C-alpha cells in the first residue's frame, strides 16, 4: 500500500518578499506559500517504524541551510582548497524563520504522534501529512535553541546509548530562556548570557533522573568538553549575524544539582570562525554598533557520553554538538517519507 522511500522535497514558508532579512530572501525564491488550512489524516490501526537517525529528510534540510548560509553569510576571507578568497562582507539582517517541508506528488509524510516516542522504534499512533511543522534552521552547538518541546516527559534520544560515539539529544519539555547581550556601552567583543539558575538547575536535575532511567540508576556526572575547537568547547550560535561563543561550564555545575540565582556566562563575539558547513575558517567584520541581544529558548541539549568502560558506578556526560545534522534530527524525528502504491 506504501513503502519507505526517499525523494526530493520542497519547502513552504510565510516569508515576506519585501524583507531584507536573509532567511526571508532565501525562502522567497526557494519555498512556496504555506497551505492556508491543511489537514492530516489519522491512520487507523497502523503501526509504523521510524528511525530519526537514518532519515533522508535531515540530509535535504542540511543542503538548504548550507545554501542559505553560503548565499547570505559570505565572509571577508575564506579558505577554499588552498587559495585565499577575498570578497565583500556587508552586515546582514539575520533572524531564522520557520520552514515547512512538503512531499511531492505520489508521496506523503507519516507523522508519529506518540507522546513519548524516542525517534527509533515502532509508533502506534500515526498520521499522514502533506508538510511538516515550521522548523527554524537554528545553527547551534551544545544547546538546541528555539526548537519544539516534548509534549510530556523529557526524552533521551540516541540511535544507541551503548555506542559512546553516538550523539545524545536531550529533548526538554519546558524551555529555559537564555538571554545573550553585547551591550552598547572597552572590548567590543565581550558579551554574556544570563540564565535563570533556579529554573535551569531544576531542569538539569530532571535530566539526570531521566538518564538514570537509561543507565541502571548509576550516578550521572556532567563535565566540560575535554578538547576540540572553540565551536564545541563552547556554546556556539549566530545572533543578528554575529557569531557568539559562550562558556557553559557554569550550566553543568554538579554541586547545584541537588546555588540558584542568575547565571551569567562569559561570551565573546568572534570574527574568525571554523565553518560548520564544511572546511576552512571564515573571517567576518567586527560587530555592529549598538545593543546586540538575543533571547532564545533552550529546548534541548546535545551530550556525548564518556567511554569510561562502564566498570565504574558513575557515568559522565559532556556537552557535544558540531554535527549540525543533529539539530535538524531533533526536529524531524517524528517524520518520514513514504511512497504511495
Amino acid at each position: 500500500v506504501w513503502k519507505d522511500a526517499d525523494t526530493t522535497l520542497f519547502c513552504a514558508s510565510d516569508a515576506k518578499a519585501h524583507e531584507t532579512e536573509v532567511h526571508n530572501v532565501w525562502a522567497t525564491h526557494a519555498c512556496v506559500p504555506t497551505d492556508p488550512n491543511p489537514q492530516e489524516i489519522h491512520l487507523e490501526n497502523v503501526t509504523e517504524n521510524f528511525n530519526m537517525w537514518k532519515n533522508n529528510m535531515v540530509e535535504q534540510m542540511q543542503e538548504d541551510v548550507i545554501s542559505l548560509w553560503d548565499q547570505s553569510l559570505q565572509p571577508c576571507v575564506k579558505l577554499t582548497g588552498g587559495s585565499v578568497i577575498k570578497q565583500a562582507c556587508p552586515k546582514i539582517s539575520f533572524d531564522p524563520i520557520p520552514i515547512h517541508y512538503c512531499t511531492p506528488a505520489g508521496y506523503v509524510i507519516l507523522k508519529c504522534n506518540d507522546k513519548n516516542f524516542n525517534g527509533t522504534g515502532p509508533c502506534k499512533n500515526v498520521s499522514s501529512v502533506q508538510c511538516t511543522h515550521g522548523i527554524k534552521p537554528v545553527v547551534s552547538t551544545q544547546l538546541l535553541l528555539n526548537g519544539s518541546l516534548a509534549e510530556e516527559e523529557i526524552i533521551i534520544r540516541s540511535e544507541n546509548l551503548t555506542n559512546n560515539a553516538k550523539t545524545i539529544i536531550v529533548h526538554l519539555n519546558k524551555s529555559v530562556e537564555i538571554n545573550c547581550t553585547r551591550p552598547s556601552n572597552g572590548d567590543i567583543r565581550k558579551a554574556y548570557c544570563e540564565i535563570n539558575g533556579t529554573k535551569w538547575n531544576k531542569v538539569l536535575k530532571q535530566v539526570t533522573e531521566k538518564l538514570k532511567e537509561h543507565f541502571n540508576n548509576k550516578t550521572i556526572i556532567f563535565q566540560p568538553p575535554s578538547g576540540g575547537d572553540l565551536e564545541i568547547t563552547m556554546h556556539h550560535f549566530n545572533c543578528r549575524g554575529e557569531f557568539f561563543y559562550c562558556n557553559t561550564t557554569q550550566l553543568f555545575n554538579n554541586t547545584c544539582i541537588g546555588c540558584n540565582g542568575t547565571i551569567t556566562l562569559p561570551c565573546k563575539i568572534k570574527q574568525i570562525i571554523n565553518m560548520w558547513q564544511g572546511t576552512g575558517q571564515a573571517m567576518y567584520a567586527p560587530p555592529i554598533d549598538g545593543k546586540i541581544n538575543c533571547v532564545s529558548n533552550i529546548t534541548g541539549i546535545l551530550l556525548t557520553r564518556d567511554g569510561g568502560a562502564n566498570n565504574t558506578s558513575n557515568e559522565t556526560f559532556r556537552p557535544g554538538g558540531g554535527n549540525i545534522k543533529d539539530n535538524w534530527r531533533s526536529e524531524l524525528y517524528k517524520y518520514k517519507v513514504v511512497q504511495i502504491e
Partner: antibody
Amino acid sequence: RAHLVQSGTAMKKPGASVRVSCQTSGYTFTAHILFWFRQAPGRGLEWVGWIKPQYGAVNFGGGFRDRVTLTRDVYREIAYMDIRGLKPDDTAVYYCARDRSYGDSSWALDAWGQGTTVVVSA
Amino acid sequence: YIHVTQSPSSLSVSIGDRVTINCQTSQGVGSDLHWYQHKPGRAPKLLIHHTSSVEDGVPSRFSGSGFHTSFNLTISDLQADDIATYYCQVLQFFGRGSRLHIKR
C-alpha cells in the same frame, strides 16, 4: 583509496611523553572518525579513544583521558596522539584506524595505519 | 562492558580446508559484528562488517553469519594467505582472537 601512515617507533624513559602522528589521504578527512587503539605484546587490541576531525571532538577509554590528548590538522589531514607520563605498561603498538562510515559511526575500521611501536623503559 | 570470547583460541588447519570460527558476546549484539585479520608486524585488515557484509576486495571465499550472541567467520577453500589471527569486534571491544597455523 583511504590510506593512513603513522610515525616511526619511539624510545622513551619513564615519565616522558610521546607524540604519535597519523597522516591520512585518499578520502574526505572530516567525514570519517579516526580511532586510536593499542596492542601490548601478547594482549588483545585495547581502545584508547577517537576524534571527530570536523571540530576535534574526542572520547577516551578507561583511564586514557587523564594522559592522552587527541588533536588533528584538518588542512594537512593528519591526526595526533600525545601521551604524557609514560609508564612501562604503556609499551605497545599504537594503531590509527578510520571508520568506514561516511559521517556516522559504525566502529568498522576499514583503513589502518601500519602501527607505531612505543617502548617505555628506564 | 561487552566481553568478547573467540573459540577455538588456537586451531590446527590444512590448506584447502573449510574453516569456521566462532565469536560470542556478553549481551545481545544484533548484527553490527565486525571481523578482522591480523598478521604479526602488519596492520589489521577489515574482512566483514555487520556480520555478513564482506568488504570490497576481500576474496569471495570469506563469509560471515550469526546473530544476537554467536557469530561465525567461515572460509571455504583455505589458502596460504588465510593463515593469521582473526579478531571479532563490537564497538570498542575487540576479541582476543583465534590464530590459525598449518597442520603437519
